[PDB]
């Protein structure tokens, strides 16, 4: 536990001033005893004391709310699942709400929290810093969040954003602010027609036979493919090229933020986050051309270096699309 804490004026909280007006913190907890969980009573007292009538709180946990009247009802909820991302629609809704609040008084602060004030919190903090003009790139904004939230004098565990889709989504915000005036790009609708996984050896059965793919849109399954069986698909394994190629059938029209989960019947293939071997998010409107290809570092779960004997340096997943217009 080397997150940068606030220990002044009779407070001891897991609370970081990323800037003078932008706070990152963990969940305001109740009935806790206690150590490194912030008691809601103390957090409430902190804001009422140090920023009277000049704070707004952002709760990023889809999983849990709390008594917002402890914060005089100045709480805004962004529903994001642990280890996942907001929809771009929700991210921009958040950005505008923070703008409305921050534009009204130079002394106003925002406090962004989640469960651990790490992944989800960093995603929105880094996006806000881009909006506010402090940084011109997602990489730098993310780097800065990491350096503020991590106290390296306490320990060497990084406390910034690490999961690949969260990094991609801050990247998406950069692209939006640089190319689309801060608003969503033109709607692009797509169908997945193919999936290709390179360096398949050592991953489950190492030939795709154990794998399945679920496409999720707006928190609902919209397609399931089971490879070996030919369930909504046709599998082809190439031993010499160390890759599997699967034709994807019956994919409905996809729009917006799409989560793709890969599941396995292999006991050998460990599960990371999201109760599966690997997954990723993308946005249909930010797809360029007829495909999206993701390297190991860009996929959720293979991003962790402990998996790097399983997912080797050339492990990639490519989705092929047809334009829902041709």
Ligand X SMILES: O=P(O)(O)O[C@@H]1[C@H](O)[C@H](O)[C@@H](OP(=O)(O)O)[C@H](OP(=O)(O)O)[C@H]1O
Q: Note the residues at the interface with ligand X (CB under 6 A).
A: 31, 63, 82-83, 114-121, 162-163
Pick 25 or 190: Cβ nearer ligand X: 25
Radius of gyration of the chain (CA): 21
296's CB contacts (< 8 A; 6+ apart) are 302, 303, 308, 311, 312, 313, 314, 315, 316
Residue nearest to ligand X (CB): 116
Give all strands (DSSP E) within 160-290, no chain letters.
190-198, 211-217, 220-226, 233-238, 243-248, 257-264, 278-283
Residue 287 to residue 308: CA distance in whole angstroms = 27
Residue 23 to residue 117: CA distance in whole angstroms = 10
Q: How far is the CB of 29 from ligand X (least distance, A)?
A: 6
Segment holding 41, helix H or strand E? helix 40-50
Q: How far is the CB of 38 from ligand X (least distance, A)?
A: 12
Q: How far is the CB of 164 from ligand X (least distance, A)?
A: 10
Q: How far is the CB of 27 from ligand X (least distance, A)?
A: 8
Q: How far is the CB of 271 from ligand X (least distance, A)?
A: 12
Pick 64 or 178: Cβ nearer ligand X: 64
Tokens of 117: 């004030």
As a dihedral over the C-alpha atoms of residue 36, residue 42, residue 43, residue 47, rounded to 10 degrees, the angle is -150
Classified as helix, coil or strand, 217 is: strand
Residue pair 183/239 in contact (Cβ under 8 Å)? The answer is no
Q: How far is the CB of 251 from ligand X (least distance, A)?
A: 29
Q: How far is the CB of 16 from ligand X (least distance, A)?
A: 12
What number of other Cβ atoms are within 10 A of residue 123's Cβ? 30
Give all strands (DSSP E) within the chain, no chain letters.
15-19, 22-25, 55-61, 75-80, 109-113, 190-198, 211-217, 220-226, 233-238, 243-248, 257-264, 278-283, 291-295, 316-323
Pick 72 or 162: Cβ nearer ligand X: 162
Pick 127 or 232: Cβ nearer ligand X: 127
Pick 44 or 163: Cβ nearer ligand X: 163
Pick 56 or 120: Cβ nearer ligand X: 120
Pick 54 or 76: Cβ nearer ligand X: 76
Query: How many alpha carbons fall within 13 Å on the CB side of residue 104?
Result: 13
Pick 115 or 318: Cβ nearer ligand X: 115
Q: How far is the CB of 122 from ligand X (least distance, A)?
A: 7
Tokens of 187: 């709607």
As a dihedral over the C-alpha atoms of residue 63, residue 131, residue 143, residue 84, rounded to 10 degrees, the angle is 20
């Amino acid at each position: 536990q080397n997150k940068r804490r606030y220990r002044k004026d009779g407070f001891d909280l897991d609370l970081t001033y990323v800037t003078d007006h932008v706070i990152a913190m963990s969940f305001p907890s109740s009935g806790r005893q206690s150590l490194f969980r912030n008691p809601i009573g103390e957090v409430s007292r902190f804001f009422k004391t140090k920023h009277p009538d000049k704070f707004r709180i952002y709760n990023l946990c889809s999983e849990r709310g709390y008594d917002e009247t402890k914060f005089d009802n100045h709480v805004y909820r962004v529903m994001i699942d642990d280890h996942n991302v907001p929809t771009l629609v929700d991210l921009l809704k958040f950005i505008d709400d923070a703008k409305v609040w921050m534009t009204s008084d130079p002394d106003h602060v925002i406090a962004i929290h989640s469960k651990g004030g790490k992944g989800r919190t960093g995603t929105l903090v880094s996006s806000w810093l881009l909006e506010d003009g402090k940084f011109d790139t997602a990489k730098e904004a993310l780097e800065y969040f990491g350096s503020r939230r991590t106290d390296f004098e306490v320990g060497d565990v990084f406390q910034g954003v690490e999961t690949a889709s969260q990094i991609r989504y801050v990247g998406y915000f950069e692209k939006i602010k640089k190319n689309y005036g801060g608003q969503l790009p033109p709607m692009k609708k797509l169908k997945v027609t193919g999936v290709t996984i390179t360096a398949i050896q050592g991953v489950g059965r190492g030939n795709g036979s154990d794998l399945s793919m679920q496409i999720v849109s707006e928190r609902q399954e919209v397609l399931l493919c089971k490879f070996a069986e030919g369930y909504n698909c046709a599998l082809q394994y190439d031993a010499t090229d160390d890759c599997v190629t699967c034709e994807v059938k019956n994919c409905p029209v996809l729009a917006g933020d799409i989560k793709v989960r890969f599941m396995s019947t292999s006991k050998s293939l460990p599960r990371g986050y999201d109760n599966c071997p690997f997954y990723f998010w993308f946005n249909t409107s930010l797809v360029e051309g007829d495909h999206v290809t993701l390297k190991r570092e860009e996929i959720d779960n293979p991003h962790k270096k402990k998996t790097w004997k399983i997912y080797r340096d050339n492990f990639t997943v490519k989705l092929t699309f047809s334009d829902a217009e041709d």
